[PDB]
């Protein structure tokens, strides 16, 4: 159509509000892109990929995910056979070829409105029933996949392990932890320093046992909504209407972003520091220890000591019973990484033990995290922040958290945008104030 | 009923200051921020940034002009931990470690957010298109960026902005040392966003003042002729159009005010968003590209392009800080 | 702490004289019939 029935072109998509036949055409096509983009990067990365070196060295934002589900990884993070990585990407491409094809089919030759061809698929935005019916199915389907994760966890192969008694790699969970004690009460923790909100997740088996609930909660959700219908208090609020639905989606989707921003940047459990690169807190942390061992190795005892700043050269005693590293690192005494925790004793680090208990991998790996402390530039000028033209990288762990944040930020605005236009639309004056009768015109004048 | 009547009073528009439901958070938190601010700004024990050595007096009682006075942010010893009153051991302990900072910015931010909505839920109740809250996101983006976000990238509120007129200057310079923000593109747009804001603010301010249908005598003030509620157009577009339309070529003059004023409000805003993105890009240590040894001779000597001077100056600062 | 001894008068005159000069003009306007 044209602007005559509608509004201007630069915004022209929302001309689709009342056409569902075109609307499916949009999403299915759009979903086609997202899928197609997924496999593309996979193959794109796979062509430039070097299996020998580590993953974070490669500037690789995707293969780690596929790997994290334990395909082609091997112990030691070996990245054994790339063929599973190849299969994933190409399949999504072939899947997209179907999607957009359909997306086009609804875009043009498909019926311009669905209220007729299929009454079941037909829906009116203002209807608070047949729509809620739809909300069930997805909430069922979206709940299926959550379980389908656990199908990978408990049954097929096994998911990545952050902490193994050695090598920290591959395990098939046997008993998932489930109960409201450590699950519902889990998110009840403080968001702030020392206790992550959802970002703690010490044990892997939390997420699996956790997703079980989210698996079995959502399946209830559909069965709940499919068999129910909004109550009074629901009807009085929420502004049932085409826009608002999009507006709510944003707010949820926005807050998801900031959370996703938080995991990648902090949590080591889900994203293993191994092939996602070391977490920012771990970076300076591990570096602080490599300095420790290299000096403690040779003719020096750093245990009881003072520094030029006065706090000591390496180790300090926190206000808590545990003793930590000094320097800037002291701001992170909360970090517990796969390599560090065993080195730690009952309260803080056991110095006598630190010297002896070092492994071949630990010290090497702990030093391997020294070179990469998340940093870098847009042209990828790396090394320590002002270090001059050496070791040029930006750890992928830093990209995601940056990226998703910026996007997540906008969606806050977006949410705060449509929610305005949604309600004002329902309120009817979204079209602009009415020149005949100004609502302000007749009011008590303060 | 009391409630149904009370609810009607909060929402009510007759108030000299509209308090929407967001005002229920906004008013107490800000009023609680300011009170705990001005006091803490005036009397702050010499808050310590590092428990090692050096207490810092940013308080006003100790020998500080408004310029030098600031509220010191929390220490590194406290790290990023949530550090309320009661959690701290002693009251003086809570001040000596930089409590009042961590107290103000929380109530401030959480106050600033609800404000962003309070502008909205008034606009909805006066029957007017509600996009102001979009425009207001630009500062609020910057607020969260410099106060809340950037320290998360550093894991400690110490690196957060010390709030004060000297504190701010200290912040940028040190911030310039590490991340080389000047060469960063997002900032380099933010400049354009601010200037072109100030720029357009002059022209669109000028051209319309230039053209005034004259209801006034020469002796009388020129302003007073405008009667609040004139349904006449106070300023000729036809006159001012050709003006800018002759000054430059007639094609670009933006005939439509509704087209203009939007563009008037798009340029500064979008300009600012990139900065609050430019910071968050920095907080994660993704820095502005610094072209260095872009030039070299065949002899391996360094021709030393300008950026190196900056690269040195920053390299100069960072050593100074520590 | 030590200070410019006369610097205080600066503020006072810089506060009052411009201030006052605005009042006097204003109170007049209030008296306009």
């Amino acid at each position: 159509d044209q602007e005559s029935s509608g509004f201007a072109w630069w915004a022209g998509n929302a001309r689709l509000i009342n056409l569902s036949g075109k609307l499916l055409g949009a999403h299915v096509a759009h979903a086609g892109l997202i899928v197609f983009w997924a496999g593309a990067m996979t193959l794109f990365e796979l062509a430039h990929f070097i299996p020998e070196k580590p993953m974070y060295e490669q500037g690789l934002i995707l293969i780690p995910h596929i790997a994290t589900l334990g395909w082609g990884v091997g112990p030691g993070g070996e990245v054994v056979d790339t063929f599973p990585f190849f299969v994933v990407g190409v399949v999504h491409l072939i899947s997209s070829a179907v999607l957009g094809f359909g997306g086009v089919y609804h875009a043009i030759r498909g019926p311009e409105t669905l209220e007729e061809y299929s009454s079941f698929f037909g829906y009116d935005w203002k209807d608070k029933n047949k729509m809620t019916t739809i909300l069930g199915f997805h909430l069922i389907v979206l709940g299926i996949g959550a379980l389908l994760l656990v199908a990978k966890a408990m049954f097929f192969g096994g998911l990545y392990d952050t902490w193994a008694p050695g090598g920290g790699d591959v395990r098939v969970i046997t008993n998932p932890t489930l109960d409201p004690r450590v699950i519902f009460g889990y998110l009840l923790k403080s968001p702030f320093g020392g206790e992550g909100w959802i970002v703690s997740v010490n044990n892997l088996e939390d997420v699996v046992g956790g997703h079980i609930w989210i698996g079995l909660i959502c399946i209830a959700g559909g069965i709940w909504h499919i068999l129910t219908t909004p109550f009074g208090w629901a009807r009085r609020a929420f502004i049932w209407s085409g826009e608002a639905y999009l507006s709510y989606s944003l707010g949820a989707l926005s807050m998801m972003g900031f959370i996703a921003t938080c995991f990648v940047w902090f949590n080591n459990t889900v994203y293993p520091s191994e092939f996602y690169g070391p977490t920012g807190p771990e970076a300076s942390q591990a570096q602080a220890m490599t300095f420790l061992i290299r000096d403690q190795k040779l003719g020096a005892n750093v245990g009881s000591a003072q520094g030029p700043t006065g706090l000591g050269k390496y180790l300090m005693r926190s206000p808590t019973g545990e003793i930590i590293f000094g320097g800037e690192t002291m701001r992170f005494w909360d970090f517990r990484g796969p390599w560090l925790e065993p080195l730690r004793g009952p309260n803080g680090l056991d110095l006598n033990k630190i010297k002896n208990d070092i492994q071949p991998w630990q010290e090497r790996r702990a030093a391997e995290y020294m070179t990469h402390a998340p940093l870098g530039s847009l042209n990828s000028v790396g090394g320590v922040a002002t270090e001059i033209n050496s070791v040029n990288f930006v750890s992928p762990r830093s990209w995601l958290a940056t990226s998703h944040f910026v996007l997540a930020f906008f969606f806050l605005v977006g949410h705060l945008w449509h929610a305005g236009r949604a309600r004002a639309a329902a309120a009817g004056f979204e079209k602009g104030i009415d020149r005949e009768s100004e609502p302000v015109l007749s009011m008590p004048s303060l | 009923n009391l409630w149904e009547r009370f609810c009607n009073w909060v929402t009510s528009t007759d108030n000299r200051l509209y308090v929407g439901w967001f005002g229920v958070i906004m008013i107490p938190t800000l009023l609680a921020a300011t009170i705990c601010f001005v006091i803490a700004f005036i009397a702050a024990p010499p808050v310590d940034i590092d428990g090692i050595r050096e207490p810092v007096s940013g308080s006003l009682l100790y020998g500080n002009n408004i310029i030098t006075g600031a509220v010191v942010p929390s220490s590194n010893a406290i790290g990023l931990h949530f550090y309320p009153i009661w959690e701290a051991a002693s009251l003086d302990e809570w001040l000596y470690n930089g409590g009042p900072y961590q107290l103000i910015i929380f109530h401030f931010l959480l106050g600033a957010s609800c404000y962003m909505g309070r502008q909205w839920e008034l606009s909805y109740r006066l029957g007017m298109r509600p996009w102001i809250c979009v425009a207001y996101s630009a500062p609020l983006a910057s607020a969260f960026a410099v106060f809340l976000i950037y320290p998360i990238g550093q894991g400690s509120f110490s690196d957060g902005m010390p709030l004060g007129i000297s504190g701010t200057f200290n912040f940028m310079i040190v911030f310039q040392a590490e991340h080389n923000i000047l060469m960063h593109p997002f900032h380099q747009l933010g400049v354009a966003g601010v200037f072109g804001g100030a720029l357009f603010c002059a022209m669109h301010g000028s051209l319309v003042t230039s053209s005034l249908i004259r209801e006034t005598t020469e002796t009388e003030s020129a302003n007073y002729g405008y009667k609040f509620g004139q349904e006449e157009e106070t300023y000729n577009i036809v006159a001012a159009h050709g003006y800018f339309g002759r000054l430059i070529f007639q094609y670009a003059s933006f005939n439509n005010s509704r087209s203009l004023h939007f563009f008037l409000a798009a340029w500064p805003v979008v300009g600012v968003w990139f900065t609050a993105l430019g910071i968050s890009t920095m907080a994660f240590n993704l820095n502005g590209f610094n072209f260095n040894h872009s030039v070299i001779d065949a002899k391996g000597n360094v021709i030393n392009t300008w950026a190196d001077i900056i690269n040195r100056a920053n390299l100069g600062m960072e050593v100074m800080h520590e | 702490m030590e200070v410019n001894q006369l610097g205080l008068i600066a503020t006072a005159l810089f506060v009052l004289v411009p201030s006052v000069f605005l009042i006097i003009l204003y109170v007049q306007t209030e008296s306009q019939q």
């Binding site: 004048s445 303060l446 | 000299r16 200051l17 001005v38 005036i42 006003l60 009682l61 020998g63 002009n65 408004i66 009667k227 609040f228 509620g229 | 702490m1 200070v3 205080l8 503020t11 506060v15």
Partner: peptide, 30 residues
Amino acid sequence: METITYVFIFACIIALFFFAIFFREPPRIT
């Protein structure tokens, strides 16, 4: 001396705000 001037100057600001918000002459229509 030094400080007590600032608080004074800063006080009259507030005493202006509260004063300028509520006591402004309403600009009536027409």
